[PDB]
């Protein structure tokens, strides 16, 4: 994994991670695919009680990204937003 990725990660405990993989699940073909589309990324953060707006999305493409967000990718996402609740 990216060393700073790391950084982002190291934030979740073990039972967020199980909880973000399961969400994460019922956006792919499991068994074909390992990336969700930029859409369905506002949608699985938000299966998670996350609010990002259309334009932070797109912010978090353009600076996290490797169109299309796998798990590690997700997970660092989930934390930024994360810590943006009021
Ligand atoms: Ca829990």
Do not use: H, W
Not at 25 to 35: H, L, M, P, S, T
Not at 42 to 71: A, H, S, W
């Amino acid at each position: 994994m990216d060393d700073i990725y790391k950084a982002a990660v190291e934030q979740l405990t073990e039972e967020q991670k199980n909880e973000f993989k399961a969400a994460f699940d019922i956006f792919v073909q499991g068994a074909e695919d390992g990336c969700i589309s930029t859409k369905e990324l506002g949608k699985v953060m938000r299966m998670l009680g996350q609010n990002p707006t259309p334009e932070e999305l797109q912010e978090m493409i353009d600076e996290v990204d490797e169109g299309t967000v796998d798990f590690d990718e997700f997970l660092v996402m989930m934390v930024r937003c994360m810590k943006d609740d009021s």
